[PDB]
Design a protein around this ligand. Structure first.
Ligand SMILES: *[C@@H]1O[C@H](CO)[C@@H](O[C@@H]2O[C@H](CO)[C@@H](O)[C@H](O)[C@H]2NC(C)=O)[C@H](O)[C@H]1NC(C)=O
Ligand SMILES: *[C@@H]1O[C@H](CO)[C@@H](O[C@@H]2O[C@H](CO)[C@@H](O)[C@H](O)[C@H]2NC(C)=O)[C@H](O)[C@H]1NC(C)=O
Ligand SMILES: *[C@@H]1O[C@H](CO)[C@@H](O[C@@H]2O[C@H](CO)[C@@H](O)[C@H](O)[C@H]2NC(C)=O)[C@H](O)[C@H]1NC(C)=O
Ligand SMILES: *[C@@H]1O[C@H](CO)[C@@H](O[C@@H]2O[C@H](CO)[C@@H](O)[C@H](O)[C@H]2NC(C)=O)[C@H](O)[C@H]1NC(C)=O
Ligand SMILES: *[C@@H]1O[C@H](CO)[C@@H](O[C@@H]2O[C@H](CO)[C@@H](O)[C@H](O)[C@H]2NC(C)=O)[C@H](O)[C@H]1NC(C)=O
Ligand SMILES: *[C@@H]1O[C@H](CO)[C@@H](O[C@@H]2O[C@H](CO)[C@@H](O)[C@H](O)[C@H]2NC(C)=O)[C@H](O)[C@H]1NC(C)=O
Ligand SMILES: *[C@@H]1O[C@H](CO)[C@@H](O[C@@H]2O[C@H](CO)[C@@H](O)[C@H](O)[C@H]2NC(C)=O)[C@H](O)[C@H]1NC(C)=O
Ligand SMILES: N[C@H]1C[C@@H](N2Cc3nn4cccnc4c3C2)CO[C@@H]1c1cc(F)ccc1F
Ligand SMILES: N[C@H]1C[C@@H](N2Cc3nn4cccnc4c3C2)CO[C@@H]1c1cc(F)ccc1F
Ligand SMILES: *[C@@H]1O[C@H](CO)[C@@H](O)[C@H](O)[C@H]1NC(C)=O
Ligand SMILES: *[C@@H]1O[C@H](CO)[C@@H](O)[C@H](O)[C@H]1NC(C)=O
Ligand SMILES: *[C@@H]1O[C@H](CO)[C@@H](O)[C@H](O)[C@H]1NC(C)=O
Ligand SMILES: *[C@@H]1O[C@H](CO)[C@@H](O)[C@H](O)[C@H]1NC(C)=O
Ligand code: NA
Lengths: 728, 728
């Protein structure tokens, strides 16, 4: 008999997916690493040369974590001494290498403890942030110009985000934005003076005698938020004036009446910038479009160019208002917004007209706009076959909206139903990346004729390996509840037999705009559970889930911990009725939001689930951060939504855990969902006399992603599931 | 078919030991609390009167925690609003009730949040500490005189101890000592300015949005220690208009040359005080004897009255240098010290002579001196039947040391082998307290002819209830290692059948001077495990254990985590070869020091133990406090004992946990053994890929003693042991 996909296979990566990560450096060349050499490829013909020999930095004396070539090709920025901070942020050292002199720059180096660095989009200017202030270098070997003087650790952040803006607003650490040709540098400044601190212990190596207390400005729901200001500096003036003026652009009056956020910054032209602002009550946003006034040196935002985006049924955007994509002249833009039926589609705006024109429509959604040329807009959607969990690339003719071509749908329809794309600098070529349901496939295409040029990586080596393995299958389908389709997937054991009763594990996330039923190919823990342990691993996208319109997504508005929890319970009941599930052996697990839902389900008293595992769960919404929580829950005040905040805790359900086996797991240095959240769950369970299993992971954060802890946690959870299901 | 002693019996206190806690108020009367009344008893005849009616405080408006009657009987101090701090420390509110005029005192009340209060030993003066400063009240209704003005939270402590002096030196929060008639008040002042702080999170009620960070001055091994000064104030010459003058008594030069401690304060007469000082290297101590000089108003300690106590094989004293017991005139004293054979015996000293005379001798030890008259000294020892785990009361004729009479040995030798005693004011009467091997027995005696006056409490009610329960028995015996006998006990299941094989749990503590093999009767977790689950629960006293001389106790000097760990393995090895032990089911558990030993044993690679449980273990001596750790280990410096600090950690043994099942448990608010210690164990186990079981207890301290956590931990451990032993 062929072997199975075992736990050790998962944990040791024996069966590896190959990727093809390229970096476009122009409209027709890309960089690609191969055998630690950086090669440069010609896209049209597929030929290559060595861009940088892998021997180049043998004598560097440090392992180089990443590199970044200046847009003009003249320099390479070398990143080393890399230390992770939060999801996106990190600390590192940097050196610059002159590619023409084939020489390292030893003068006026980027300092130690630099927080962020970026090249200008053209040429080779650098902007970096060090000790919370912005610096610009016009040339890599010359002195820096200081841009801000207010930077203060944990208090004032210039050009980088604080914790909550990084995690919840920008999905990025950087808070600066070069203008398209590099003349201007726009940046945000955050003031956390009165934001309360989360404090937790970090134990470090065993040599550390006293634990360190980590202290981070972190606004929990309803707490004082960071305030924000926006500035633009002319970097071309730096070498001519002693201290160049940062010109502030103020938020509109409709935002200044209360707490608000800066949520998007997008340059439209060399002298026009768009800013979107969001009210703390996140159902109202405003875009200003601001023009540089050459005679006054100021930036002015005409109210005739201001665009309002609001929601009557929920919050604005999927996780925030969408970004605009400006036409070359900057006088019009395209933006994904929810149409009158609640489906997200592409709308076309003139900058000084308030009514836009939808250029796509239907009962499906546009996921993202990927490229815009003078003649075509390229976008990704889930239109194809009415499958919300598929993704394909489309092209729409700007002179005639009835001409829409699917570029990816029929390329390999059995193997490939989930695409992303990477366009060259002026969209002359594109790389398609298919990620399922078959093995991933990376291909290169020419935009002039939409012809396939070549296969970049087809994963045939892996395909060969998997031939000798009893792999599970995946089923993606829907059930109908109240005349609405709700999608599910199942990872099914090899030789699945519909006449047998299998144990079922419900793998849950179920956060707002989540999607756990899709066409993506994964090699993960579920692969082992199905393949080796003969467990069915199911996931369900119920109310609150994304990419299916606002009626579904906004069903949980102001009501987290209700329908999305109920719909997972109902999903399990529906799976029992399918006839191949052992009703005595249904379990549930999740991480993060999934841990909250899992815990809520286990505490519901439904009687459906024998056991479950919550990893780093939210337990009480007042413990989680303001920006995410309030987006869905409003404010925890008597005037707003306090009663539901208080009604949706895990702790209030502690008595019902007497009916289940529960394993609670949390990293002690989780900066995101504080260990506090599980500390309060455990205390509530202790207080009502409920036995349960627990595991803390010393100095692990929300990812529990260190190599040893990752292997440990999946090993511990595997034991627990097997015990619950009486598997030897 | 009668019941067993169940887990719920242990957790719910079904079978209660009755006490007889009295408080002597004179040579012939004592107070006893009965049905919320306070009675006064006549010792000679056993008749009583009501001293204070329960009903007196019916409309008090607060729950009264405790009471303290002034020595002259005129006043009662009422303690309420009790808030626990560490092992001994707490704050509370106090009111004083006048017993003669039958009224609460409303003038000049003791403030809220008072840290310590005590009556003078004669009359009804009060001293109290509030906000770290000392106050004295001459009369309950009159204003306090402020004695100290330097008190500062976490920095300067007047009249109360800091964390480490409380836990490790004085076993008390108070650092006030009244002279015998109340004229003088001596006190210590602690200065923790440069002592580092342990910091840890406290989660509190679910309502608390942000966790609190608790910060406590706590010197870990080798860290900066608190400094100490000692003062005496005359309370008879206090003034309303002038600040009180405190006279300092400075430590001897032999102490002032480096770090040191104040370790004992004992008044000898109305005008003579003795102080003992201990070097930070705790093998050298000095007693000063200081006399009040009425013409200078100063305290002088003559060098000819200094007494040095040192140890060549270890540290001084069992846990600290022993207390002196002065004669009526204060010109001589008796003190327990280690003799030339290493056995602790009573030495008689003249205050101005260097050599003392031992008045007892032999291969057994004196446990404590209990009372002293002009004709007799009364002490407790383990001499009887050469059993180190038994305790009896003796008297020795001071005119003829060959005349020693056992006063408790033969009273009831089958029921009673472990005594303590409480003498009346001038030793005219004594209460004997038998705590095993039978049910506790409380009796009253008169010293003149050692008459056994009456039985105060015989627990005949409990005896009656226990007749209908299948109770375990206790075997106390010894094994011979390298020609030394070492004692053990086994809690044996009911109907013990030596032809059957029982699983065995080794219950371990094994700290320096510990004794876990004794004749004490206990109703505890082991009782349930033996009675209901048929597990033998054994304990063993090996090298490092107490009450058997320094050759045994000092064997672990400078070497914690060696012989005491080895000796537990050897005992289990020997138990495993007895015909009634199943060698496939041997487990080990312990708490605190016992958790360290358990962990070290399970990490030894001995293969003897299937599983074990460590509750709040020490894992690395550098993490524990200076005073305890350094007593046994010296300083963690390269020139002292650093190498041994470094190879005595649990973490270094992680790989050896591969072949055992381990459950690790720790309270997150443990101020004593910081959660840090277990956090480092878990990380080390994770790092070598060893699976284990864990449980944290939110906001529990070293005792894990709140009602709900206590029930939960023993429930969780019981499941673990039963699973390990395949018991239903
Ligand atoms: C891929 O091949 C092309 C064409 O052969 C190379 O482009 C140049 O071709 C000219 C012919 O006029 C040669 O003289 C040079 O060798 C090439 N110049 C440069 C700057 O590349 C091209 O080099 C190849 N691309 C890569 C990345 O190697
Ligand atoms: C960040 O915000 C704080 C307000 O929270 C500002 O601090 C105030 O500044 C004024 C001076 O203009 C002082 O008079 C106030 O006392 C300060 N308030 C507090 C609460 O500290 C601070 O100026 C801001 N910093 C920047 C660079 O904008
Ligand atoms: C460059 O200009 C900025 C803005 O005018 C200066 O920042 C001010 O500095 C002064 C005193 O050092 C403060 O009182 C102001 O509150 C600051 N304003 C801002 C916006 O930061 C900065 O100090 C100047 N740098 C130099 C070298 O002159
Ligand atoms: C980048 O764009 C900027 C902004 O339009 C250009 O700067 C202007 O250049 C024109 C010259 O044609 C001048 O009249 C203006 O005074 C400049 N304005 C400012 C604010 O600097 C700039 O020339 C462009 N840079 C490059 C390299 O093409
Ligand atoms: C308690 O101890 C500290 C020393 O730790 C004494 O404080 C001062 O020590 C600093 C070092 O922190 C020196 O600057 C001074 O010499 C010390 N003070 C003085 C006045 O010299 C502190 O004074 C002590 N406090 C008490 C009340 O005894
Ligand atoms: C407590 O003992 C003290 C100290 O011996 C006594 O105080 C002395 O009393 C006599 C009066 O007979 C004076 O001559 C001394 O000057 C006192 N000494 C001091 C230091 O005050 C005191 O009498 C005793 N107190 C009681 C209540 O008996
Ligand atoms: C108290 O203990 C210390 C530590 O064991 C003894 O220290 C001496 O100094 C170092 C150890 O730190 C060694 O080099 C010496 O050999 C130690 N002396 C010995 C072994 O005699 C110190 O001697 C002890 N004090 C007493 C009174 O015994
Ligand atoms: N902090 C959130 C961010 C959330 N989003 C995913 C995502 N996809 N996406 C696409 C475009 C823009 N933004 C986003 C986000 C941000 C994922 O859950 C996180 C989270 C939620 C909890 F309740 C608890 C812990 C968490 F880590
Ligand atoms: N801090 C010590 C104190 C020690 N006690 C002191 C003391 N004085 N004393 C007088 C007569 C009889 N017994 C004692 C003891 C026992 C008990 O262990 C405690 C302990 C040891 C650890 F390794 C870890 C945590 C602990 F809490
Ligand atoms: C924004 O939300 C609040 C609370 O739900 C509501 O009162 C307000 O009307 C909303 N705004 C819009 C535009 O619907
Ligand atoms: C007990 O009895 C004696 C003698 O009868 C009596 O005078 C004395 O006051 C009594 N003591 C108490 C405390 O009742
Ligand atoms: C103790 O606190 C209570 C409650 O505020 C207050 O009424 C009382 O005056 C306080 N007692 C003293 C002695 O200050
Ligand atoms: C007593 O000492 C304190 C603190 O040094 C001072 O403030 C106070 O005024 C003094 N009182 C008298 C009466 O000297
Ligand atoms: Na009698």
């Amino acid at each position: 008999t062929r072997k199975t996909y075992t736990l050790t296979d998962y944990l040791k990566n024996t069966y590896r997916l190959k990727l093809y990560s390229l970096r476009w450096i122009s409209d027709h060349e890309y960089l690609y690493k191969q055998e630690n050499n950086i090669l440069v490829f010609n896209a049209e013909y597929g030929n290559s040369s060595v861009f940088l020999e892998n021997s180049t930095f043998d004598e560097f004396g440090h392992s180089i974590n990443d590199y970044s070539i200046s847009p003009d090709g003249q320099f390479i920025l070398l990143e080393y001494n890399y230390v992770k901070q939060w999801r996106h942020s990190y600390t590192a050292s940097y050196d610059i290498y002159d590619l023409n002199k084939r020489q390292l720059i030893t003068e006026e180096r980027i300092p130690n403890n630099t927080q962020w660095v970026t090249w200008s989009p053209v040429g080779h200017k650098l902007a970096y942030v060090w000790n919370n202030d912005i610096y610009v270098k016009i040339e890599p070997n010359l002195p820096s110009y200081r841009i801000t003087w207010t930077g203060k650790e944990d208090i004032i952040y210039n050009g980088i985000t604080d914790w909550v803006y990084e995690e919840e607003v920008f999905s990025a650490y950087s808070a600066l934005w070069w203008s398209p040709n590099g003349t201007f540098l726009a940046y945000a400044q955050f003031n956390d003076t009165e934001v309360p601190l989360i404090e937790y212990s970090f134990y470090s190596d065993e040599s550390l005698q006293y634990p360190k207390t980590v202290r981070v400005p972190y606004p929990k729901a309803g707490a004082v938020n960071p305030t924000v200001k926006f500035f633009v500096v002319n970097t071309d003036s730096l070498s001519s004036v002693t201290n160049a003026t940062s010109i502030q652009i103020t938020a509109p009056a409709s935002m200044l009446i209360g707490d608000h956020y800066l949520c998007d910054v997008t340059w439209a032209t060399q002298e026009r910038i768009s800013l979107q602002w969001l009210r703390r009550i996140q159902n109202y946003s405003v875009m200003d479009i601001c023009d540089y006034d050459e005679s006054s040196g100021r930036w002015n935002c005409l109210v005739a160019r201001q665009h309002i985006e609001m929601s009557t049924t929920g919050w604005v955007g999927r996780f925030r208002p969408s970004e605009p994509h400006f036409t070359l002249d900057g006088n019009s833009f395209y933006k994904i917004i929810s149409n009158e039926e609640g489906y997200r589609h592409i709308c076309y705006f003139q900058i000084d007209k308030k009514d836009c024109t939808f250029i796509t429509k239907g009962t499906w959604e546009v996921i993202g706009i990927e490229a815009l040329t003078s003649d075509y807009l390229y976008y990704i959607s889930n239109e194809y076959k009415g499958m919300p969990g598929g993704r394909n690339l489309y092209k729409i003719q700007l002179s005639d909206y009835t001409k829409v071509t699917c570029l990816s749908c029929e390329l390999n329809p059995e193997r490939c139903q989930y695409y992303s794309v990477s366009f060259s600098k002026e969209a002359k070529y594109y790389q398609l990346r298919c990620s399922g349901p078959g093995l991933p496939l990376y291909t290169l295409h020419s935009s002039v004729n939409d012809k396939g040029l070549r296969v970049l990586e087809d994963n045939s080596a892996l395909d060969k390996m998997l031939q000798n393995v009893q792999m599970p299958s995946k089923k993606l389908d829907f059930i109908i509840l109240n005349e609405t389709k709700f999608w599910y997937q199942m990872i099914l054991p090899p030789h699945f037999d519909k006449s047998k009763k299998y144990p079922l594990l419900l793998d849950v996330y179920a956060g707002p705009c989540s999607q756990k039923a899709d066409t993506v190919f994964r090699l993960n823990w579920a692969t082992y559970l199905a393949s080796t342990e003969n467990i069915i691993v199911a996931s369900f996208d119920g109310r609150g889930s994304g990419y299916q319109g606002d009626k579904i997504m906004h069903a949980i508005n102001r009501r987290l911990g209700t329908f999305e929890v109920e719909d997972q319970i109902e999903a399990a009941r529906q799976f029992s009725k399918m006839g191949f599930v052992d009703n005595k052996r249904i379990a549930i697990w999740g991480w993060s939001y999934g841990g909250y839902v899992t815990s809520m389900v286990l505490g519901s008293g439904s009687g459906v689930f024998k056991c479950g595992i919550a990893v780093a769960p939210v337990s009480r919404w007042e413990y989680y951060d303001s920006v995410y929580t309030e987006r869905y829950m409003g404010l925890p005040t008597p005037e707003d939504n306090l009663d539901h905040y208080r009604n949706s805790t895990v702790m209030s359900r502690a008595e019902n855990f007497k009916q289940v086996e529960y394993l609670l797991i949390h990293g002690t240095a989780d900066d995101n969902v504080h260990f506090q959240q599980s500390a309060q769950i455990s205390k509530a369970l202790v207080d009502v006399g409920v036995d349960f299993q627990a595991m803390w992971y010393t100095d692990e954060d929300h990812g529990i992603a260190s190599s040893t802890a990752h292997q440990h946690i999946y090993t511990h959870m595997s034991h627990f599931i097997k015990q619950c299901f009486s598997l030897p």
